[PDB]
């Protein structure tokens, strides 16, 4: 179906402990494929998925140089934002930025993104038109006017409509055996007695890729949304993900409960029950 490429930048000042650290990671869908860390003994863009390793030295040098330049650029930006908020030189602050593109099954641009936060709070974002900005406050308006004068939105649009989708398409083909393979969840239902009155039914999904999944409990065919404990989807470390959903049921009523699983890797949606 559709696919995404995203870069995630984190720039963190640390007064008294050297200059701000700059980390960049790149993802295609839920697969990380590159990383950069300015704290590394020798900072370079480094592969994190096998299918990117076939890119040649020019690729690695170019993406390394952009990241080293960004290390300096984001240090300038941190100094600037400290001033925009009248903050002292003593505190640690964080700029985060996410940017990238979504493409459809036919590879055409669906939407581009560029969004920034300061100390965990939304700061400035490129609107969906790839042409105008939404600034969170009067400090971000300074960045907005700076980027408007520099026609920076036009530069984002050119990147997002060109290089972003072109290289995403290349990555998807080069890594098609994994990036374009959905692995279904392996599922089971467990039963954990609580008391003579109640027991927990837990519906498990293991080993699935990508992370998008829907796990729900129904009681007599009605969703138990408010009564379902739904753990955050979590990585297994082998590219796959794990999730479970649990509901507390009255003893003897277990067969009124069904777990429903939807995932791209599944031939059809699953309906599971406790099987004692």
């Amino acid at each position: 179906g559709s696919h995404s490429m995203r870069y995630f930048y984190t720039a963190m000042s640390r007064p008294g402990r050297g200059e701000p650290r700059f980390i960049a990671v790149g993802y295609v869908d839920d697969t990380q494929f590159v990383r950069f860390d300015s704290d590394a003994a020798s900072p370079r863009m480094a592969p994190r998925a096998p299918w990117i390793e076939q890119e040649g030295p020019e690729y690695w040098d170019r993406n390394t140089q952009i990241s080293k330049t960004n290390t300096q650029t984001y240090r300038e930006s941190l100094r600037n934002l400290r001033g925009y908020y009248n903050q002292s030189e003593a505190g640690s602050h964080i700029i985060q930025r996410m940017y990238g593109c979504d493409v459809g099954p036919d590879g055409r641009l669906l939407r581009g993104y560029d969004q920034s936060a300061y100390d965990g709070k939304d700061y400035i974002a490129l609107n969906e038109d790839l042409s105008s900005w939404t600034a969170a406050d009067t400090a971000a308006q300074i960045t907005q006017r700076k980027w408007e004068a520099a026609r920076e939105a036009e530069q984002l649009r050119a990147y997002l409509e060109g290089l972003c989708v072109e290289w995403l398409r290349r990555y998807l083909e080069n890594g098609k055996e994994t990036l374009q393979r959905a692995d279904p969840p392996k599922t089971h239902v467990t039963h954990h007695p609580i008391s003579d009155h109640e027991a927990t039914l837990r519906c498990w999904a293991l080993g699935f890729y990508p992370a998008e999944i829907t796990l729900t409990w129904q009681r007599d065919g009605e969703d138990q949304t408010q009564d379902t404990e739904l753990v955050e989807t979590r990585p297994a470390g082998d590219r796959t993900f794990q999730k479970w959903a649990a509901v507390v049921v009255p003893s003897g009523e277990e067969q009124r409960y069904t777990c429903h699983v939807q995932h791209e890797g599944l031939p059809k949606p699953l309906t599971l029950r406790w099987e004692p």
């Binding site: 870069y7 330049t69 960004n70 650029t73 300038e76 972003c164 290289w167």
Partner: peptide, 9 residues
């Protein structure tokens, strides 16, 4: 592929 030539904030 990263975007180059970013303007500072």
């Amino acid at each position: 592929e990263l975007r180059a030539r970013e303007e500072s904030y």
